[PDB]
Amino acid sequence: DDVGIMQQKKPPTVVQSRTDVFNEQFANEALHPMTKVIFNGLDVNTEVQP
Amino acid sequence: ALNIDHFAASVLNINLRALMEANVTADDRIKALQAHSMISTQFHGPNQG
Amino acid sequence: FVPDVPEGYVAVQYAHRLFSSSLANKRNRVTYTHPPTGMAYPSPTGRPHVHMTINERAGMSKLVADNIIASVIKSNWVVDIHDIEYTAEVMTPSEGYTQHVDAESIMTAPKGKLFHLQFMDGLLRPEPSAFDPPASGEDMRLIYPLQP
Amino acid sequence: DDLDEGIRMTTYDQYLSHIRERLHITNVPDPIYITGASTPDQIAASVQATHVAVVLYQSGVINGSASTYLRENEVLVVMPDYYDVVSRFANANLQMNNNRYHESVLEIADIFDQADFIQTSDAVRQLRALMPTLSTSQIRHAIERIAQITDVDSTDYGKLTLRFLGTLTRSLKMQNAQIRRIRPDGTVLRYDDQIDIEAFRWSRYFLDELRLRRLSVGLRLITNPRIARRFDGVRIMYLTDDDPDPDFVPDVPEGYVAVQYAHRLFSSSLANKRNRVTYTHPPTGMAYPSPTGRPHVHMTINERAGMSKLVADNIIASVIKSNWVVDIHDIEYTAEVMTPSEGYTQHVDAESIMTAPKGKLFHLQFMDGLLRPEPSAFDPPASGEDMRLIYPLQPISVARSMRAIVNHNEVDRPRGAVAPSSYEMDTGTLSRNGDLLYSPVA
Amino acid sequence: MLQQPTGGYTTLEQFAFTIRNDGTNATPTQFLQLLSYEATENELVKKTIPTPETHLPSARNVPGNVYIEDAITQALFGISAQNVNAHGYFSRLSALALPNTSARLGLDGVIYNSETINIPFYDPAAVANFAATYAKLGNASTPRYRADMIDIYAHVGLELAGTDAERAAGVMPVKRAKFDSWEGSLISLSRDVVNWKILAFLIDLCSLEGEALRAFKTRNRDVFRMMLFIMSTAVAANVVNRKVTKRVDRVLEYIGVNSMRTAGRTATITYDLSRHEFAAKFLQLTFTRWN
Amino acid sequence: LSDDFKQISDPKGYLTYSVKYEDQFTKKDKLRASEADDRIVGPTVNLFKYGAAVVNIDLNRDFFDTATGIDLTKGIPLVQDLLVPIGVTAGAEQSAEYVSGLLMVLFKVMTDNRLVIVGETTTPMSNTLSTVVNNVLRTTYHNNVGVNPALLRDFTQVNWLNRDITNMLQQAGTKYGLGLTETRLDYVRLVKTIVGH
Amino acid sequence: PALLRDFTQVNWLNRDITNMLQQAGTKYGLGLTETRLDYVRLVKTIVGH
């Protein structure tokens, strides 16, 4: 129970469905625990407070 | 339990109490930033606490 | 065609004050509140059936501005917008679609912008054959009008 | 009841193979025939001379008083074939003739108490009924392979070579081959001492004490619940949570309809403007021509062979977009736990889990994650994350001893960690004569 | 086995409960007074509690020698527990309520398969009625079955500072607790309560009957109040220290309201989000069964 | 003379230990002990290094080797050929390659022939052992001591794990002990003498 | 037209074969049926397929 210093490991996250017509099929998918983000290239918080 | 004299031992103990005790959360630093920008700017991020 | 609120739903307002970041298990994830009961729901799953309406997209932290859409596809959330202008037009069966708006540019774009959509007619659409092996995959729609 | 007592039934062929050639070595008159009349008196008196306590059933109906003498004395009955047992004794008052059903057990031939015979135990049978049925040529091949892995070659074996015929080959599958004397006509005789020595009395062809004592101990490692690591079946669901440890079977939700998978309930019919693969609800007989509300069911695939495409997708799509609980069985896999750090090394697909050949066992690794430091207070949040698609139902952890040897806080165990058992930490004493002992307890 | 003592398993005395009032231990009754109560202009209404859905997780028997009793005590009072709500431990427990099962709950709090000689336990019937009710907590987390939180806390308060004319009536004014202090006192009492064998107090709260119960609730009215306070600490929002004379004092901000987080990250014990999911479904069972 | 079985210095064993370390869990307290306090409980400490994820047991990778066809990279004893489709060509992977490998590991244990010979043994002194590691040793240990829990009685900083170990080695239901122990079959001479280790 | 009793997509035809073939009248078979052994030599000679 403590905050790690060395960087960890990731799935890693992937973008998918956005537009107003999909027609997805659900082929493949791996079955391993992963992450899927809706918006492309987010993670915006560049402010650093010393 | 160290070997430094009772003066320096008393100084370091009082210097530690006021750090653990006296509190300032991440929010208090986010409340200060709302005083140096166009009124109505919105801040999000680090958990308040 | 305007799809409505199916059945058991509750209309709530929007304020950045109800979308706060918290800590569940071993990670930081944006948490909902659901004002009529004051709960948690730390994931885009199990969230009670809402009819959340948005008046203005002002302080929409692009993270929590996304999390709403991600909850539309996993909890049947029926959301709204009121400041958006569009000049979508009827389209014929063949030729189909061309360009299309992104489900992210329609949540984090300037208030002034006027972007047009594109809708389908489908009445003179060619139907299937008699005996045939059925093909797989399904069609989806994400943004409906309410005018009509 | 009790899943015990009652009466003990055995097929006649199983009797003649094991029991008959063994009670024949000693000088006991063959087991008495069960009377059409009732003999609840001498049933055990004639069985006392034979000692085995098994009684041969023949014809007629067993008496009411002979129906209870069999239950109490632990005596056994051998019927030629059981279509029923109702008419064999006519269960008079209580309900037994064919209602409160049987079960399946093993006997280990403990009903003798004569030493030097029955060396092998229960466990050998369990190992046998696990492999596919071997044909004559397969057995011949299997004998040859084990022989040549230890150098000692078999140039010719069982095969007789006449110079005016070529090379004819026999089979090599004997069983309880008891070398016995042949009479002139070509018939097995029997055991008449003073004519046939002592070397030909039994025995399992093996190197006296040395092999039988070595095999006896080594057989027990083979049938141990820590070596058998070929877990069967996999349940496939689409709840998204993740958990500290592997082997987390997510129980089927509160209210579901369990339907048996058929090669019929999936039909192809027209809906709206196109052809679609449609489900058909067995209890209500409905349509649902799209992977949406079904409503949710509990599927169970047994034959994942003739399922074919298109249908293999409607199953793997309704689990995602309708919360279906599916299932597989023929799939065989070898599981091994994986440390939280370093992550996965190999990832399979949900389409290949529906086309994998019946007898080809692939390995699919399961993630741990009990010992993983949580993130710092200041960092970017998350949005709609991980969905896991597969689950073992065993569980897949037989080798453990101890787990995650790290302390929490400073003086307590982390939630879900185990210590070594008080068995691998007890050096016993030698037996009163031969082997190893334990404590003794209390 | 120890059979069962008539009048409680808590009247045995082998295992009791003593808060460590610094260098000298005491009794829960003796500790409650050092605290006074400040009535503020806020009011809570005693809200009724919904029934608990009956659907405890099915039986599995993975081989773990699960410390079910140890896990329970850890989440409610334990200092910064981790993975408290994981599914595997409870499922194993529910096997316990089953008539005729070779699975005995150890007196020390460790669950076994089959049995042992060297270890005495609780007779199978005492545990049977216990796990009938606390196995349910197991699935408290599920989206469908999950319990409330922002409202059960209208009960915590009446008990901690519930005046007798107040728990006689329905509504109590929002109070503000304040008591003498030793600086590391909040964490210190929380470190201490973790070893009470809280199993014993619960495995008999389902076995005691009509008269033996009337006497049980009228005596341990403290042993309950204690773990309630220590628990209500993590929840209330602001901890203010008062420096008077030569004394030092801790004020707990609001006894009856879920602030939703923090309490004092340093001055006390904190509750994660997988804690409100747990401690809530816990109180939903002890309270209902309690009254 | 025929010479049936051959003798060895140290026995092997069928069941061994494995581990998966986490290379980010190090305690900042470099502890220390004596040299005889080290040797007896030495290699067992370096199999349970502070921060080990899982420590499981299985078939030995060594005793059953490719010299006898036995192959186990997976955790399952997999042999290459035993029972097979004859007319048809074999497969790249088959579930039958297991019920044939488990039948092959049963062959090797049966055709065994080894005699243990006492060698390398040394004796420590009472002045040079912790009072905990002393009443567990029977005069003379075997120098090439193997790994075992309970032996790491008081050498791990894992405060929790240290508990159950003491409790189990207290209830009189179990008694751990290595070294030259007492035997029934004793002084029985054939060429030298029978001792029990 | 019987060895495909569970390999065809055509739905109607499938149920039909696995009904008149499953019937208590007929039954399908394939491969080695039985063997005639030799008197003096003791080897398989005339096999039925």
PDB file of C-alpha atoms in Angstrom, chain D residues 127 130-132 134 137-139 141-143 145-146 149-150 206 210-211 214-215 217-223 226-230 332 334-341 358-363 368 371-373 399-408 410-414 417-433 438-442, chain F residues 5 14-15 17 20-22 24-25 27-28 47-59 64 67-70 74-86 91-99 102-107 109-113 138 148-150 152 157-161 164-165 168-169 171-178 182-185:
ATOM      1  CA  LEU D 127      -5.742 -43.464 -15.124  1.00  0.00           C
ATOM      2  CA  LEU D 130      -8.926 -41.146 -19.395  1.00  0.00           C
ATOM      3  CA  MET D 131      -7.146 -42.027 -22.657  1.00  0.00           C
ATOM      4  CA  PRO D 132      -8.882 -42.817 -25.982  1.00  0.00           C
ATOM      5  CA  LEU D 134      -6.575 -48.037 -28.302  1.00  0.00           C
ATOM      6  CA  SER D 137      -2.151 -51.605 -34.203  1.00  0.00           C
ATOM      7  CA  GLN D 138      -2.051 -48.619 -31.812  1.00  0.00           C
ATOM      8  CA  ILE D 139      -1.222 -50.872 -28.840  1.00  0.00           C
ATOM      9  CA  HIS D 141       2.932 -49.142 -31.790  1.00  0.00           C
ATOM     10  CA  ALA D 142       2.736 -47.935 -28.163  1.00  0.00           C
ATOM     11  CA  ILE D 143       4.618 -51.013 -26.906  1.00  0.00           C
ATOM     12  CA  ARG D 145       7.835 -46.731 -28.661  1.00  0.00           C
ATOM     13  CA  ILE D 146       8.267 -47.188 -24.877  1.00  0.00           C
ATOM     14  CA  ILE D 149      13.081 -44.968 -25.710  1.00  0.00           C
ATOM     15  CA  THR D 150      15.140 -47.119 -23.308  1.00  0.00           C
ATOM     16  CA  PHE D 206       6.826 -57.878 -12.688  1.00  0.00           C
ATOM     17  CA  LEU D 210      11.096 -54.518  -6.262  1.00  0.00           C
ATOM     18  CA  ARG D 211       8.780 -53.347  -9.077  1.00  0.00           C
ATOM     19  CA  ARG D 214       8.132 -49.093  -6.529  1.00  0.00           C
ATOM     20  CA  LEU D 215       5.045 -48.882  -8.753  1.00  0.00           C
ATOM     21  CA  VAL D 217       4.326 -45.481  -4.408  1.00  0.00           C
ATOM     22  CA  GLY D 218       4.875 -43.941  -7.867  1.00  0.00           C
ATOM     23  CA  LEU D 219       1.239 -44.529  -8.839  1.00  0.00           C
ATOM     24  CA  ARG D 220       0.121 -42.121  -6.087  1.00  0.00           C
ATOM     25  CA  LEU D 221       2.057 -39.134  -7.484  1.00  0.00           C
ATOM     26  CA  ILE D 222       0.278 -39.728 -10.807  1.00  0.00           C
ATOM     27  CA  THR D 223      -3.232 -39.459  -9.302  1.00  0.00           C
ATOM     28  CA  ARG D 226      -1.577 -30.929  -7.873  1.00  0.00           C
ATOM     29  CA  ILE D 227      -0.080 -32.588 -10.959  1.00  0.00           C
ATOM     30  CA  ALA D 228      -3.276 -32.745 -13.050  1.00  0.00           C
ATOM     31  CA  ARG D 229      -3.167 -29.273 -14.621  1.00  0.00           C
ATOM     32  CA  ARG D 230      -5.364 -29.750 -17.699  1.00  0.00           C
ATOM     33  CA  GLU D 332      -8.970 -27.708 -23.496  1.00  0.00           C
ATOM     34  CA  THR D 334      -3.289 -25.254 -19.773  1.00  0.00           C
ATOM     35  CA  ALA D 335      -3.381 -22.239 -17.453  1.00  0.00           C
ATOM     36  CA  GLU D 336      -0.452 -20.539 -15.714  1.00  0.00           C
ATOM     37  CA  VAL D 337      -0.637 -17.454 -13.465  1.00  0.00           C
ATOM     38  CA  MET D 338       1.069 -14.222 -14.559  1.00  0.00           C
ATOM     39  CA  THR D 339       2.686 -11.485 -12.440  1.00  0.00           C
ATOM     40  CA  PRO D 340       1.029  -7.992 -12.528  1.00  0.00           C
ATOM     41  CA  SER D 341       4.213  -6.311 -13.809  1.00  0.00           C
ATOM     42  CA  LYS D 358     -11.403 -30.414 -30.771  1.00  0.00           C
ATOM     43  CA  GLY D 359      -8.243 -32.103 -29.464  1.00  0.00           C
ATOM     44  CA  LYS D 360      -5.675 -29.305 -29.794  1.00  0.00           C
ATOM     45  CA  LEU D 361      -4.893 -27.880 -26.351  1.00  0.00           C
ATOM     46  CA  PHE D 362      -3.595 -24.302 -26.402  1.00  0.00           C
ATOM     47  CA  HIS D 363      -2.431 -22.335 -23.361  1.00  0.00           C
ATOM     48  CA  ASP D 368      -2.724 -11.961 -11.260  1.00  0.00           C
ATOM     49  CA  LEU D 371       0.715  -7.045  -5.478  1.00  0.00           C
ATOM     50  CA  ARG D 372       0.519  -3.836  -7.520  1.00  0.00           C
ATOM     51  CA  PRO D 373       1.173  -0.327  -6.108  1.00  0.00           C
ATOM     52  CA  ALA D 399      -0.080 -25.404  -6.987  1.00  0.00           C
ATOM     53  CA  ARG D 400       0.230 -22.707  -4.323  1.00  0.00           C
ATOM     54  CA  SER D 401       1.954 -23.400  -0.968  1.00  0.00           C
ATOM     55  CA  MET D 402       2.350 -19.647  -0.302  1.00  0.00           C
ATOM     56  CA  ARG D 403       1.421 -16.396  -2.078  1.00  0.00           C
ATOM     57  CA  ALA D 404       2.631 -12.758  -2.123  1.00  0.00           C
ATOM     58  CA  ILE D 405       5.209 -12.629   0.688  1.00  0.00           C
ATOM     59  CA  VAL D 406       5.049  -8.851   1.236  1.00  0.00           C
ATOM     60  CA  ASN D 407       3.784  -7.084   4.373  1.00  0.00           C
ATOM     61  CA  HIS D 408       0.923  -4.570   4.461  1.00  0.00           C
ATOM     62  CA  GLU D 410       3.727  -3.019   9.002  1.00  0.00           C
ATOM     63  CA  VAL D 411       2.121  -5.835  11.067  1.00  0.00           C
ATOM     64  CA  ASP D 412      -0.743  -7.426   9.056  1.00  0.00           C
ATOM     65  CA  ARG D 413      -1.427  -9.678   6.046  1.00  0.00           C
ATOM     66  CA  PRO D 414      -2.423  -8.171   2.688  1.00  0.00           C
ATOM     67  CA  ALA D 417      -2.422 -13.886   0.825  1.00  0.00           C
ATOM     68  CA  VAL D 418      -1.671 -17.444   1.987  1.00  0.00           C
ATOM     69  CA  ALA D 419       1.023 -19.065   4.146  1.00  0.00           C
ATOM     70  CA  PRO D 420       2.575 -22.571   3.841  1.00  0.00           C
ATOM     71  CA  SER D 421       0.520 -25.478   5.221  1.00  0.00           C
ATOM     72  CA  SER D 422       1.363 -27.416   8.405  1.00  0.00           C
ATOM     73  CA  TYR D 423       2.076 -30.521   6.306  1.00  0.00           C
ATOM     74  CA  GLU D 424       5.198 -29.612   4.328  1.00  0.00           C
ATOM     75  CA  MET D 425       6.625 -28.592   7.725  1.00  0.00           C
ATOM     76  CA  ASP D 426       6.386 -31.887   9.644  1.00  0.00           C
ATOM     77  CA  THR D 427       9.158 -34.488   9.526  1.00  0.00           C
ATOM     78  CA  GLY D 428       7.568 -37.654  10.897  1.00  0.00           C
ATOM     79  CA  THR D 429       9.099 -40.913  12.077  1.00  0.00           C
ATOM     80  CA  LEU D 430       9.600 -44.305  10.418  1.00  0.00           C
ATOM     81  CA  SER D 431       6.773 -46.870  10.611  1.00  0.00           C
ATOM     82  CA  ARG D 432       6.749 -49.682  13.186  1.00  0.00           C
ATOM     83  CA  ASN D 433       8.617 -51.573  10.436  1.00  0.00           C
ATOM     84  CA  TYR D 438       3.245 -38.302  10.559  1.00  0.00           C
ATOM     85  CA  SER D 439       2.889 -36.601  13.960  1.00  0.00           C
ATOM     86  CA  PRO D 440       0.924 -38.240  15.722  1.00  0.00           C
ATOM     87  CA  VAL D 441      -1.870 -35.692  16.298  1.00  0.00           C
ATOM     88  CA  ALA D 442      -3.302 -34.798  19.750  1.00  0.00           C
TER      89      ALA D 442
ATOM     90  CA  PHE F   5      21.538 -50.026  -8.530  1.00  0.00           C
ATOM     91  CA  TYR F  14      10.465 -35.294  -7.774  1.00  0.00           C
ATOM     92  CA  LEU F  15       8.774 -32.099  -6.561  1.00  0.00           C
ATOM     93  CA  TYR F  17      10.001 -25.075  -6.097  1.00  0.00           C
ATOM     94  CA  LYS F  20       8.111 -15.104  -9.766  1.00  0.00           C
ATOM     95  CA  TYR F  21       9.852 -12.065  -8.251  1.00  0.00           C
ATOM     96  CA  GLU F  22       8.728  -8.439  -8.283  1.00  0.00           C
ATOM     97  CA  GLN F  24      10.535  -3.279  -7.134  1.00  0.00           C
ATOM     98  CA  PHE F  25       9.873  -4.493  -3.566  1.00  0.00           C
ATOM     99  CA  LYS F  27      13.348  -3.621   2.198  1.00  0.00           C
ATOM    100  CA  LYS F  28      15.878  -1.012   3.373  1.00  0.00           C
ATOM    101  CA  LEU F  47      14.375 -18.673  -2.751  1.00  0.00           C
ATOM    102  CA  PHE F  48      11.918 -16.513  -0.805  1.00  0.00           C
ATOM    103  CA  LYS F  49      13.448 -13.078  -1.473  1.00  0.00           C
ATOM    104  CA  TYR F  50      11.355 -10.227  -0.054  1.00  0.00           C
ATOM    105  CA  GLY F  51       8.683  -9.453  -2.653  1.00  0.00           C
ATOM    106  CA  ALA F  52       8.006 -12.807  -4.323  1.00  0.00           C
ATOM    107  CA  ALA F  53       4.642 -13.003  -6.115  1.00  0.00           C
ATOM    108  CA  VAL F  54       3.914 -16.758  -6.264  1.00  0.00           C
ATOM    109  CA  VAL F  55       5.871 -19.818  -5.078  1.00  0.00           C
ATOM    110  CA  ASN F  56       4.356 -23.036  -6.472  1.00  0.00           C
ATOM    111  CA  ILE F  57       5.340 -26.728  -6.667  1.00  0.00           C
ATOM    112  CA  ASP F  58       5.315 -29.218  -9.574  1.00  0.00           C
ATOM    113  CA  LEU F  59       7.267 -31.951 -11.394  1.00  0.00           C
ATOM    114  CA  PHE F  64      12.476 -36.261 -15.841  1.00  0.00           C
ATOM    115  CA  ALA F  67      16.901 -38.170 -22.248  1.00  0.00           C
ATOM    116  CA  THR F  68      13.679 -40.111 -21.565  1.00  0.00           C
ATOM    117  CA  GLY F  69      11.355 -38.219 -23.943  1.00  0.00           C
ATOM    118  CA  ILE F  70       9.671 -36.324 -21.090  1.00  0.00           C
ATOM    119  CA  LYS F  74       4.237 -25.623 -19.970  1.00  0.00           C
ATOM    120  CA  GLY F  75       3.784 -27.170 -16.489  1.00  0.00           C
ATOM    121  CA  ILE F  76       2.263 -30.290 -18.012  1.00  0.00           C
ATOM    122  CA  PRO F  77       4.384 -33.411 -18.756  1.00  0.00           C
ATOM    123  CA  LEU F  78       4.193 -33.551 -22.568  1.00  0.00           C
ATOM    124  CA  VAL F  79       5.660 -36.512 -24.463  1.00  0.00           C
ATOM    125  CA  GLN F  80       6.035 -36.453 -28.267  1.00  0.00           C
ATOM    126  CA  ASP F  81       4.726 -39.902 -29.269  1.00  0.00           C
ATOM    127  CA  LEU F  82       2.943 -42.715 -27.423  1.00  0.00           C
ATOM    128  CA  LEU F  83      -0.650 -43.291 -28.582  1.00  0.00           C
ATOM    129  CA  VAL F  84      -1.557 -41.790 -31.957  1.00  0.00           C
ATOM    130  CA  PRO F  85      -3.638 -41.891 -35.168  1.00  0.00           C
ATOM    131  CA  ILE F  86      -1.795 -44.390 -37.395  1.00  0.00           C
ATOM    132  CA  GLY F  91      -0.941 -33.196 -35.217  1.00  0.00           C
ATOM    133  CA  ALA F  92       1.072 -30.102 -34.285  1.00  0.00           C
ATOM    134  CA  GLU F  93      -0.597 -30.211 -30.858  1.00  0.00           C
ATOM    135  CA  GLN F  94      -2.788 -32.888 -29.247  1.00  0.00           C
ATOM    136  CA  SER F  95      -4.466 -33.444 -25.864  1.00  0.00           C
ATOM    137  CA  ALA F  96      -3.329 -37.069 -26.215  1.00  0.00           C
ATOM    138  CA  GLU F  97       0.287 -35.868 -25.810  1.00  0.00           C
ATOM    139  CA  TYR F  98      -0.581 -35.563 -22.098  1.00  0.00           C
ATOM    140  CA  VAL F  99      -2.352 -38.827 -21.179  1.00  0.00           C
ATOM    141  CA  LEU F 102       1.538 -38.812 -17.612  1.00  0.00           C
ATOM    142  CA  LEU F 103       1.796 -42.521 -18.464  1.00  0.00           C
ATOM    143  CA  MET F 104       5.506 -41.964 -19.196  1.00  0.00           C
ATOM    144  CA  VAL F 105       6.372 -40.148 -15.936  1.00  0.00           C
ATOM    145  CA  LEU F 106       4.885 -43.219 -14.205  1.00  0.00           C
ATOM    146  CA  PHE F 107       7.359 -45.439 -16.081  1.00  0.00           C
ATOM    147  CA  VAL F 109       9.519 -43.561 -11.216  1.00  0.00           C
ATOM    148  CA  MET F 110       8.916 -47.340 -11.390  1.00  0.00           C
ATOM    149  CA  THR F 111      12.236 -48.293 -13.044  1.00  0.00           C
ATOM    150  CA  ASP F 112      14.242 -46.348 -10.431  1.00  0.00           C
ATOM    151  CA  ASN F 113      17.399 -47.594  -8.667  1.00  0.00           C
ATOM    152  CA  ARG F 138      19.964 -32.859  15.309  1.00  0.00           C
ATOM    153  CA  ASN F 148      12.020 -25.401   2.987  1.00  0.00           C
ATOM    154  CA  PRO F 149       9.503 -23.167   4.802  1.00  0.00           C
ATOM    155  CA  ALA F 150       9.564 -23.326   8.641  1.00  0.00           C
ATOM    156  CA  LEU F 152      13.086 -19.487   7.613  1.00  0.00           C
ATOM    157  CA  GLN F 157      11.087  -9.208   7.491  1.00  0.00           C
ATOM    158  CA  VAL F 158       7.625 -10.246   6.285  1.00  0.00           C
ATOM    159  CA  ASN F 159       6.075  -9.681   9.724  1.00  0.00           C
ATOM    160  CA  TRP F 160       2.727 -11.337   8.946  1.00  0.00           C
ATOM    161  CA  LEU F 161       4.176 -14.507   7.358  1.00  0.00           C
ATOM    162  CA  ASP F 164       1.509 -18.694  11.216  1.00  0.00           C
ATOM    163  CA  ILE F 165       4.893 -20.460  10.973  1.00  0.00           C
ATOM    164  CA  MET F 168       2.096 -24.282  13.526  1.00  0.00           C
ATOM    165  CA  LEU F 169       5.524 -25.097  15.007  1.00  0.00           C
ATOM    166  CA  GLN F 171       0.721 -26.653  18.577  1.00  0.00           C
ATOM    167  CA  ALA F 172       2.672 -29.938  19.055  1.00  0.00           C
ATOM    168  CA  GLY F 173       0.873 -31.284  15.963  1.00  0.00           C
ATOM    169  CA  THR F 174       4.030 -30.765  13.888  1.00  0.00           C
ATOM    170  CA  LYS F 175       7.786 -30.936  14.558  1.00  0.00           C
ATOM    171  CA  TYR F 176      10.334 -29.818  11.948  1.00  0.00           C
ATOM    172  CA  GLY F 177      13.937 -31.012  12.224  1.00  0.00           C
ATOM    173  CA  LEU F 178      16.908 -31.605   9.928  1.00  0.00           C
ATOM    174  CA  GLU F 182      17.456 -41.517  15.564  1.00  0.00           C
ATOM    175  CA  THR F 183      16.369 -44.708  13.759  1.00  0.00           C
ATOM    176  CA  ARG F 184      15.042 -48.232  14.377  1.00  0.00           C
ATOM    177  CA  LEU F 185      17.249 -49.764  11.686  1.00  0.00           C
TER     178      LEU F 185
END
